[PDB]
Amino acid sequence: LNPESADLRALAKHLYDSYIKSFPLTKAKARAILTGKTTDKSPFVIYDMNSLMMGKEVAIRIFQGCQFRSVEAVQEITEYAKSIPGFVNLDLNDQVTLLKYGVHEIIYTMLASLMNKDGVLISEGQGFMTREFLKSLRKPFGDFMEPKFEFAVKFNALELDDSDLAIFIAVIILSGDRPGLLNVKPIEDIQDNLLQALELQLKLNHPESSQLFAKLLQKMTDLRQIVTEHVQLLQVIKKTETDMSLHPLLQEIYKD
Amino acid sequence: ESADLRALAKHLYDSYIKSFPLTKAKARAILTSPFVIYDMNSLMMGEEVAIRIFQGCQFRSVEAVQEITEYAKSIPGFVNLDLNDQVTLLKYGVHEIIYTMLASLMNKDGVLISEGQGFMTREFLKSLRKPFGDFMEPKFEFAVKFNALELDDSDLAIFIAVIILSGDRPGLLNVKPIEDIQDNLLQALELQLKLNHPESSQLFAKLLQKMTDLRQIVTEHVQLLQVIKKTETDMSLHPLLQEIYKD
Numbered sequence: 001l002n003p004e005s006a007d008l009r010a011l012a013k014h015l016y017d018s019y020i021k022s023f024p025l026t027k028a029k030a031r032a033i034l035t036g037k038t039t040d041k042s043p044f045v046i047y048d049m050n051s052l053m054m055g056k057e058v059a060i061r062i063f064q065g066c067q068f069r070s071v072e073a074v075q076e077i078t079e080y081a082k083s084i085p086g087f088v089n090l091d092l093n094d095q096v097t098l099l100k101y102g103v104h105e106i107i108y109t110m111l112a113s114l115m116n117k118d119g120v121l122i123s124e125g126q127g128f129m130t131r132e133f134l135k136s137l138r139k140p141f142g143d144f145m146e147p148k149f150e151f152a153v154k155f156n157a158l159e160l161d162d163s164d165l166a167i168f169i170a171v172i173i174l175s176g177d178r179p180g181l182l183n184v185k186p187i188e189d190i191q192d193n194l195l196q197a198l199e200l201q202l203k204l205n206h207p208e209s210s211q212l213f214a215k216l217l218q219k220m221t222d223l224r225q226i227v228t229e230h231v232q233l234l235q236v237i238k239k240t241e242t243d244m245s246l247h248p249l250l251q252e253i254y255k256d
Numbered sequence: 257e258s259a260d261l262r263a264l265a266k267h268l269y270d271s272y273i274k275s276f277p278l279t280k281a282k283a284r285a286i287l288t289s290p291f292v293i294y295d296m297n298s299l300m301m302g303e304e305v306a307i308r309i310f311q312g313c314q315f316r317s318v319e320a321v322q323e324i325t326e327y328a329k330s331i332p333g334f335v336n337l338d339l340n341d342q343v344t345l346l347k348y349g350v351h352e353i354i355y356t357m358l359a360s361l362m363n364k365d366g367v368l369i370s371e372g373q374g375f376m377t378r379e380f381l382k383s384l385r386k387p388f389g390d391f392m393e394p395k396f397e398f399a400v401k402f403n404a405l406e407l408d409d410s411d412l413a414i415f416i417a418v419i420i421l422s423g424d425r426p427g428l429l430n431v432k433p434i435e436d437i438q439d440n441l442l443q444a445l446e447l448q449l450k451l452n453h454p455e456s457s458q459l460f461a462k463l464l465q466k467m468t469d470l471r472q473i474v475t476e477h478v479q480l481l482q483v484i485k486k487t488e489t490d491m492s493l494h495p496l497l498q499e500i501y502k503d
């Protein structure tokens with residue numbers, strides 16, 4: 001290669017490294033747990049009430065647990081964000097805006113890593129809660145996870161690994177078509193670079209996968225819908241469950 | 257190889273020119289002489305006001321759907337798909353294409369209408385009643401961003417075909433051949449933008465990301481269209497007219 005796509009490989013390497021250091025449960029660990037494996041080890045499976053207890057009603061602590069984890073993930077993603085070259089040099093206000101619109105799309109992207117068609121890993125991989133148990137939860141909580149699984153099954157079909165995902169989520173943060181950005185130009189120059197990095201990375205890592213770059217970027221449409229749909233379901237849960245609390249961090253991100 | 261990709265591109269451009277009366281090249285020249293509609297008086301002396309304007313947007317959309325349908329049938333492979341699947345792809349595709357192509361007819365201040373014989377002001381449209389004042393605005397906001405890419409008709413012809421061959425539409429029966437065709441169209445689009453816009457880095461990626469905005473415009477637009485159902489309704493003189501305009 002030439003010394004320009006060489007700078008692109010170094011950026012890919014930097015981002016992957018930051019990704020490993022920022023996120024405790026990688027796709028590689030998640031698949032080892034889900035699949036096999038002598039590396040890593042067996043999850044306790046929650047598929048019903050008694051299994052849940054072996055692990056204030058249940059639909060609601062399950063939702064409460066999920067939202068605490070969300071906040072947990074926002075902290076991890078925010079820590080990854082800082083490592084993206086150029087990010088912390090941007091107008092502070094735009095850093096906040098990029099994160100605000102970025103984190104949930106990233107959350108559901110990385111959530112796919114922890115999912116198969118049958119359920120999702122929980123508690124850093126020590127548990128596995130089935131899709132059917134989640135869906136059997138009560139109106140409305142019953143289908144708050146379903147659009148996540150639907151996306152995940154289609155996304156996981158791309159067979160990305162962590163080194164791919166690391167650049168992808170960086171692309172997502174550095175959008176610049178985000179509402180209310182002050183300096184779009186500096187943001188777009190960064191994303192242009194990241195998109196180059198992602199394109200080279202996918203050609204090298206998935207040579208036989210045609211137009212993976214285009215198909216992965218199209219997935220960005222699925223994410224936005226999940227987020228939009230989740231936000232609305234949340235508005236509903238708030239009004240019907242007036243004793244349901246939301247974390248102010250998530251509320252602050254949700255406001256608008 | 258680049259052989260089939262350039263023929264694909266040329267073919268779609270030719271079909272695009274044939275199927276769509278007003279091209280972007282044509283519209284851009286005019287935007288830079290049309291009857292301007294800035295007021296009620298200009299609307300009248302060039303023609304329920306806000307309702308006549310909405311129903312005119314409907315007439316135009318119905319026309320556009322037929323133009324898009326004809327274009328689709330020109331996309332190599334499209335007519336060989338399961339017919340249910342062709343109908344599904346057009347069904348969920350035309351709104352996104354309608355607004356994509358509408359951006360060709362807009363600047364930040366207004367939109368061409370009636371074959372470019374007219375031009376309706378963004379402020380006049382925005383000044384309309386409720387809810388008829390918020391229906392066009394999000395399209396102007398999309399258009400301002402989309403037009404920043406400065407695509408031309410030969411770029412758009414292929415992009416439009418990419419949108420039509422979306423293998424993720426609900427209820428598709430055989431997704432494989434649809435993705436197979438889109439893959440080829442994506443290749444052709446990538447090479448087109450690389451040849452036509454060498455100095456514009458990652459234009460292919462930027463355009464694809466625009467699809468997420470498209471989808472949201474369409475989604476929130478159909479949600480306003482239901483709200484319009486809770487405005488005007490039962491009139492036994494419409495029926496045949498109402499039938500012509502489904503969704």
Ligand SMILES: O=C(O)CCCc1cc2cc(Cl)ccc2n1S(=O)(=O)c1ccc2ncsc2c1
Binds near residue numbers: 067124
């Ligand atoms: O193992 C990990 O790293 C935690 C993996 C994720 C996770 C941990 C967890 C713990 C409990 Cl007690 C309950 C649900 C849990 N989930 S989750 O998948 O349901 C989830 C997470 C984020 C999120 N944001 C919007 S909806 C949503 C749902």
